[PDB]
From a paper:
In eukaryotes, wobble uridines are modified by Elongator, a large and highly conserved macromolecular complex. Elongator consists of two subcomplexes, namely Elp123 containing the enzymatically active [name] subunit and the associated Elp456 hetero-hexamer. The Elongator complex harbors two copies of each of its six subunits, namely Elongator proteins 1–6 ([name]–[name]). Decreased levels of wobble uridine modifications lead to ribosome pausing, incorrect protein folding and consequently trigger intracellular protein aggregation and proteotoxic stress.
Residue numbers in the entry:
A (entry chain I): 5 to 273
B (entry chain A): 387 to 482
C (entry chain C): 94 to 557
D (entry chain E): 2 to 233
E (entry chain G): 67 to 176, 231 to 416
F (entry chain H): 2 to 232
The structure:
């Protein structure tokens, strides 16, 4: 029943030579319907970057502690806190010391962003990663989680300023960037966000233009069943692949996935 | 139900199957850890044209049942031209 | 063309299985004892056929003649009609009533005015407006060999024996008088006689869960005993006058929601073997008198949307039929092949032959063949040597256009001969039979008498 | 008349800059991005041999284009600077007899409408060729303009269609089991099904001539062998 | 570590985690944990102008006071249970609105040892009497967010022993909340900081809130619904269905209901990637004793 | 005490002001204005043998009607003074349910939404009985909602529908050979076919009762013989 998870022509999810090529950049865009959460995919990405294989889906997860590995990993998010990241991701056993974890929720709201000039806020939030990645320059992967929420935090900010002040510098400085977000704004029944709420959707469209691969986790259609949870889509993003080899491209396939007790299963219709 | 396979021993302590893998069971023999493995395999006769008649062989305890396909499409549950062995059966082969 | 279905009604009565259980089965609505009291059981008397039967005071001659004339006057011309009987248990009634009923039903079309049913059927064989069989409804307790001989003499071709469940508590708690296991021997004896057999099911019943509903159908389709040639699925709807409404009144009953039922139907339709014709998941109900349940007019209209979202769409006969002539010939079909399946069912080997398009899975023609066993046959025709029976011939391959160079002006008129000779080949070679027989309605006893089959008793047989 | 007797010849003359065009506009969307047409420019305009400075002014792009010879990042310049640090690389409006270069603008959606015409006024010269793409799925920002009943002026799309001398529209050719209705729907609720963003695409060409009506045709363009086929 | 008092808690049958109880009859049953896990907030919603949900907004809070008031020389175990309930409203009528205990029965059977569990309640009976400011406090919402965020942290820090239960009665009611706070940044930052504080003290703090959605634009609702970790919606019947039920139901006054229940989000169950949305299956009813949720 | 009122009798009961709430909302358009509605109010209110003193607030009315006793014109003067002048002709006492000072408003379109509540929070006294009118078709001014990403505040219609205890709306029946589709087509062209501003109109009523529930009521009203019937 079970099927392998392949995302490239080289029969490998995350090619190693991507990290071996200098003067290059790449961007992944992941969208999940907010009735489900893509954590079980972030875990797989981190394991396959560090351990070199999907250590929860295709491989066993009994030695899942990538701490103090020759590689590196940096995760930052706004939706949750440092306490949740430590306690949970260590209960999920996501590494610590060869690893960086960044909160922007706990105690950050209380007059540390509020009632301060916007330019200083943007400069400092960029400098956090600009300084946290100086240690290991070329063997890290960085993922940001739902950054568009910050748009609603800053007093009167549009897509363009946030994008050109946060996203593009991050991808220029770092090798590869992964951005994950949710898409409820496009799923309000009998209401059009295109009336006056297009500012947020502009960010999604811009990111999809700039992205290289597009990962989609979407819920089932009309009803709810037991043996299947959701649908998994892989698509080619807007930007082309900045690699140096020529035969490389992206495989094109759709999966049906079930999640239960942190255990995920993928198969075909 | 068919009696597909037997195993012989002179002692038993406990038997445990495998959670992830299957057809790999546990047993002991006077303090000796033992592991076995099984797999599906379908018996078949010759395939070449000079003797091309699909002959399917099945085992049921002390009995062997035959079915020559392309001469009869006899279904699984009923079989054709049996013969009863004095003992049970663990593997069967045919000629050319 | 001109296939016609003309339903008739029998006089009201009482099925005797009440006698050893006390009342009718719980789900049966109406009846003589109910307030209606001029109506056969399982029918409220408010159907159009009920109206046409009442005004005739339940007489077969008038009902048949009136329905035939109405259909002819509407704009269709009829030359092929199949009768179906309804209501209670027709076989319970005394001897003379059934004989007179059958003789009247045949003399309505034949134009004959005699008696001595043998002569009536003999004249009906040589008549215009041919009859293509009868459909008699009966219970397991009345399918003994004498009754089977009676039905064979009458001219019936297919039965429909309901089971309604495979569990054993349901039989006693629904006040139905037969153990489940006896239906298997009933099927075994019936099939060897050439009678196509169809069953009934009802998904929701008291003290039955969604699980048990699932694996009862799974066991029905998998077990080599419950393999039959048709099915009918009746979702449980609660009429006020039934014994089901009392349970809801006392609070001893509750039903399923809409989502649960549509999911169940979606799962069920994804398991049907390709030789069984799902008759009606969207059955016909007395609408306003139902008090509990859900709407059933478009269950499959949503189940199809469900299979399009989960995959593995239906594979029954009905969805794959192309018909006699130009139903879906708006597009030229694809590769045509012969597909032959074999299965073990009710103590015997049976073969299903079909002419199908494998790329898009449509159906053009089919045939069924059975190799007679030795532990169930009793007829003096089948107890003399080995023999095989063609239970059903079905040729929608009367289609004029086709794929792969259809006959120009011969237009598949010899298409059925292909299947007939194909059947005879394996009858002579594989079965090793010494006689082959085909069962058919009396009106079509000549489309088989040209290929060489000769008449013995109610059968069309030829040796090898 | 006796010039460009085949539409394909006209397209190739346009692509290879055989005939000068002061302004050309290309329209695209999310269903098909518009970086293959820059490859078309690079490949076709090299048969005539235009190695002349292919400046790539960028607003959003993170990567440096190999096919181009220059790279300018405009996430820190204002309008006057942005004009000023381009006239150097380009053949600015001096040396009335000189060569011509190539200009590639990555995006047009990040610029306020208030200066659009001026961005085509200070630079328009018989030495420069402006090429830029317009994403149609991004609705611009209009809180600052305050479109009340007394503060009105035309929208960006009409000005772009007016000041253009040649217009090309890009579309992705439907290949599998997706049609326009359900495609546009799924894009509206952002499910992005398979069957999108291929190299084989389709174009609509509108070419304007002086003192006359423009010509409108359609094309099928492959991005593999660089060959064209006119609409039947 | 540090000292802590849990006013009442049992292991979660579903995942072996500390779980409190709202005091409800079937709402705690349908929360998946047979209760509310220590740390995850909840949300309940009503379609129409009715005020059914208001009743729930009382029960929870009252339960805590009981769980604190039946330990002072009334529980032989004298088990360490302390709560300091905080109410954010512009009307103080709640200070005299807690419903009365029916007969007690805080049994759970079917740091200290916590056996306390739900009580028996009835709506007609008022409480006897009501807590003093030392047990329960009111904060007006119209004050600037800086003062509120400082004061909540001060209250929790200065009362480290106590268990924390917070209730927000009818958040975003236009009769008390001015338009100057309907602006997008204000409320979302307020709740973002509230979530920060709540999950910071993950051991014992629990929060509860409810709003009205008929007068709220969908974008703000979408922004808000990601802040919490559980969403329950109550939709009352239309008039026609009510008349149909009353015309059909002639032998039962208690079988009359008011509407149905929809499940949009659950506790930690959902963060492991579980599709838990389930709508148009349950039916709610307000009753003389408690709040009933049954199958329809 | 009377309960479970006859729907026509209940319609009279509200119209006779046997019950009372500190806020009542009435809606009108350019197809049927509400002068005859006030006529019905005074016809079935003072027929009980009651005076019902009336205070009038005008934003669109030009002349002093016969219904009102006192008078105040609010076009020249503004909010900060109307909050004063409203109390001058309105004592702060109890008992809305009976003969008190009834404050009537002809139009509510001309007050900023940002201060709708600040207004209404200081008028609906337990002695005060408020009734107001709103024009449905007239579009709200663009500077009342601020359609930017900051202002999540609702519009004017929903705010009034959520706040008012009881809602009454009216529409004109076209006795002519036309259809309301054609009437809308001509009105979108600002054209008036013959048959508008009649006296036999249709009415829609909603009252919030029983802890918040509501029931919609429809009738047929004749404003000459004061005939209320079912539709
Ligand atoms: S056996 Fe048939 S006729 Fe008799 S009670 Fe049951 S359903 Fe009715």
């Amino acid at each position: 029943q079970r099927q392998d998870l392949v995302l490239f022509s080289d029969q490998s999810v995350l090619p190693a030579h991507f990290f071996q090529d200098s003067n290059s950049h790449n961007l992944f865009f992941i969208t999940h319907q907010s009735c489900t959460q893509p954590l079980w995919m972030i875990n797989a990405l981190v394991e396959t970057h560090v351990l070199g294989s999907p250590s929860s889906l295709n491989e066993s997860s009994s030695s899942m502690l990538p701490s103090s590995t020759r590689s590196h990993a940096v995760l930052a998010s706004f939706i949750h806190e440092q306490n949740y990241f430590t306690n949970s991701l260590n209960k999920l056993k996501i590494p610590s010391n060869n690893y960086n974890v960044l909160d922007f929720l706990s105690d950050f709201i209380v007059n540390n962003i509020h009632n301060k000039p916007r330019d200083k806020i943007l400069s400092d939030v960029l400098a956090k990663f600009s300084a946290a990645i100086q240690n290991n320059p070329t063997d890290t992967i960085v993922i940001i989680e739902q950054p568009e929420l910050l748009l609603s935090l800053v007093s009167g900010l549009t897509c363009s300023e946030l994008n050109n002040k946060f996203i593009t510098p991050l991808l220029r400085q770092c090798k590869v960037l992964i951005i994950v977000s949710n898409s409820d704004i496009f799923n309000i029944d009998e209401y059009d966000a295109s009336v006056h709420s297009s500012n947020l959707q502009n960010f999604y469209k811009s990111s999809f233009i700039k992205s290289m691969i597009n990962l989609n986790l979407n819920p089932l259609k009309t009803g709810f069943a037991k043996d299947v949870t959701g649908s998994l889509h892989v698509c080619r993003g807007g930007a082309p692949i900045a690699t140096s080899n020529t035969s490389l491209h992206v495989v094109e396939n759709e999966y049906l996935y079930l999640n239960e007790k942190e255990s995920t299963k993928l198969f075909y219709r | 139900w068919y009696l597909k396979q037997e195993l012989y021993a002179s002692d038993i302590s406990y038997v445990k199957w495998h959670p992830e893998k299957d057809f790999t069971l546990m047993f002991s023999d006077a303090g000796f850890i033992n592991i076995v493995d099984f797999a599906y395999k379908m018996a078949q006769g010759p395939t070449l044209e000079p003797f091309d008649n699909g002959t399917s062989l099945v085992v049921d305890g002390r009995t062997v049942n035959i079915t020559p396909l392309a001469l009869a499409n006899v279904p699984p549950p009923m079989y054709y031209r049996d013969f009863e062995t004095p003992g049970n059966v663990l593997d069967v082969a045919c000629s050319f | 063309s001109g296939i016609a279905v003309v339903a008739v009604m029998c006089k009201p009565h009482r099925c005797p299985h009440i006698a050893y259980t006390g009342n009718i089965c719980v789900y049966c609505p109406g009846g003589p004892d109910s307030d209606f009291e001029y109506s056969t059981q399982s029918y409220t008397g408010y159907e159009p056929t009920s109206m046409r039967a009442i005004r005739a005071r339940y007489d077969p001659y008038e009902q048949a003649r009136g329905r035939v004339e109405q259909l002819k006057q509407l704009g269709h011309s009829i030359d092929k009609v199949e009768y179906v009987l309804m209501g209670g248990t027709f076989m319970s009634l005394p001897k003379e009533y059934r004989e007179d009923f059958i003789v009247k039903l045949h003399n309505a079309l034949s134009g004959f005015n005699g008696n001595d049913i043998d002569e009536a059927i003999l004249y009906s064989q040589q008549s215009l407006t041919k009859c293509v069989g009868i459909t008699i409804e009966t219970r397991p307790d009345y399918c003994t060999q004498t009754h089977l001989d009676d039905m064979l003499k009458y001219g019936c071709t297919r039965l429909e024996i309901g089971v309604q469940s495979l569990y054993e508590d349901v039989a006693r708690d629904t006040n139905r008088g037969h153990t489940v296991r006896s239906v298997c021997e009933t099927f075994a004896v019936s099939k060897d006689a050439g009678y196509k057999v169809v069953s009934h099911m009802m998904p929701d019943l008291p003290n039955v869960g969604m699980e048990r509903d699932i694996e009862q159908f799974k066991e029905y389709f998998e077990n080599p005993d419950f393999r039959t040639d048709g099915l009918k699925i009746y979702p449980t709807l609660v009429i006020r006058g039934t014994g089901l409404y009392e349970l809801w009144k006392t609070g001893r009953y509750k039903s399923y929601s809409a989502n649960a039922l549509v999911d169940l139907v979606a799962r069920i339709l994804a398991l049907v073997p390709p030789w069984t014709r799902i008759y009606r998941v969207q059955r016909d109900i007395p609408m306003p008198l139902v008090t509990s349940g859900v709407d059933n007019g478009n269950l499959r209209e949503l189940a199809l949307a469900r299979m399009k979202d989960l995959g593995t769409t239906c594979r029954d006969v009905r969805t794959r039929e192309v018909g006699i002539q130009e139903v879906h010939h708006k597009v030229q079909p694809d590769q045509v092949e012969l597909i032959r399946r074999d299965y073990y069912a009710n103590g015997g080997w049976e073969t299903f032959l079909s002419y199908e398009d494998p790329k898009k899975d449509i159906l053009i023609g089919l045939l069924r063949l059975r190799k007679a066993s030795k532990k169930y046959t009793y007829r003096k025709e089948f107890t003399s040597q080995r023999t095989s029976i063609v239970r059903e011939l079905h040729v929608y391959g009367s289609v004029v256009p086709l794929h792969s160079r259809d006959p120009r002006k011969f237009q598949h008129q010899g298409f059925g001969t292909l299947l007939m000779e194909e059947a005879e080949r394996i009858a002579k070679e594989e079965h090793g039979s010494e006689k082959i027989s085909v069962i058919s309605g009396v009106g079509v006893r000549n489309y088989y008498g040209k290929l060489g089959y000769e008449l013995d008793g109610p059968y069309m047989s030829k040796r090898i | 008349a006796s010039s460009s007797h085949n539409p394909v010849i006209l397209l190739k003359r346009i692509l290879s800059l055989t005939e000068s065009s002061p302004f050309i506009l290309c329209l695209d969307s999310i269903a098909q991005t518009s970086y293959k047409l820059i490859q078309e420019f690079v490949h076709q305009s090299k048969s005539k041999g235009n190695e002349y400075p292919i400046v790539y002014i960028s607003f959003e792009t993170v990567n440096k284009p190999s096919y181009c010879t220059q790279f300018i990042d405009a996430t820190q310049m204002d309008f006057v600077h942005l004009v000023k640090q381009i006239i150097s690389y380009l053949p600015a409006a001096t040396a009335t007899q000189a060569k011509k270069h190539m200009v590639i603008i990555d995006s047009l959606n990040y610029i306020s409408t208030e200066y659009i015409t001026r961005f085509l006024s200070e630079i328009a010269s018989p030495h420069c060729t402006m090429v830029a793409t317009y994403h149609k799925d991004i609705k611009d920002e209009n809180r600052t303009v305050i479109p009340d009943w007394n503060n009105n002026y035309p929208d960006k799309l009409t000005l772009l269609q007016f000041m253009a001398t040649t217009i090309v529209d890009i579309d992705v050719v439907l290949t599998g089991t997706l049609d326009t209705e359900e495609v546009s729907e799924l894009l509206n609720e952002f499910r992005i099904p398979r069957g999108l963003n291929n190299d084989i695409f389709q174009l609509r060409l509108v070419n304007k001539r002086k003192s006359g009506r423009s010509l409108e045709y359609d094309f099928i363009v492959n991005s593999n062998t660089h060959e064209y086929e006119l609409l039947s | 570590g540090l000292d802590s008092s849990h006013v009442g808690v049992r292991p979660s049958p579903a995942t072996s985690q500390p779980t409190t109880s709202t005091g409800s009859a079937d709402l705690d049953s349908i929360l998946g944990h047979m209760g509310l896990p220590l740390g995850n907030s909840v949300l309940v919603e009503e379609q129409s102008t009715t005020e059914f949900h208001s009743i729930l907004g009382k029960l929870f809070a009252a339960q805590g006071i009981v769980h604190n008031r039946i330990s002072d020389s009334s529980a032989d175990k004298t088990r360490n249970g302390d709560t300091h309930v905080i109410v954010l409203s512009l009307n103080q009528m709640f200070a005299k609105e807690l419903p009365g205990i029916y007969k007690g029965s805080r049994k759970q059977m079917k740091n200290s040892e916590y056996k306390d569990y739900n009580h028996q309640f009835d709506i007609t009976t008022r409480l006897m009497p009501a807590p003093i400011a030392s047990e329960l406090t009111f904060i007006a919402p119209t004050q600037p967010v800086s003062t509120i965020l400082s004061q909540i942290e001060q209250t929790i820090k200065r009362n480290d022993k106590k268990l924390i239960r917070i209730v927000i009665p009818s958040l975003l009611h236009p009769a008390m909340y001015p338009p100057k706070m309907f602006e997008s940044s204000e409320i979302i930052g307020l709740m973002h900081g509230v979530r920060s504080l709540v999950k910071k003290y993950y051991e014992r703090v629990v929060l509860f809130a409810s709003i009205s959605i008929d007068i709220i634009t969908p974008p703000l609702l979408v922004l808000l619904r990601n802040m919490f970790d559980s969403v329950i919606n109550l939709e009352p019947f239309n008039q026609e269905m009510t008349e149909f039920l009353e015309r059909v139901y002639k032998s039962q006054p208690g079988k009359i209901q008011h509407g149905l229940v929809h499940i949009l989000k659950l506790p930690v169950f959902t963060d492991r990637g579980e599709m838990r949305v389930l709508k148009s299956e349950w039916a709610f009813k307000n009753g003389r004793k408690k709040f009933e949720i049954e199958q329809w």
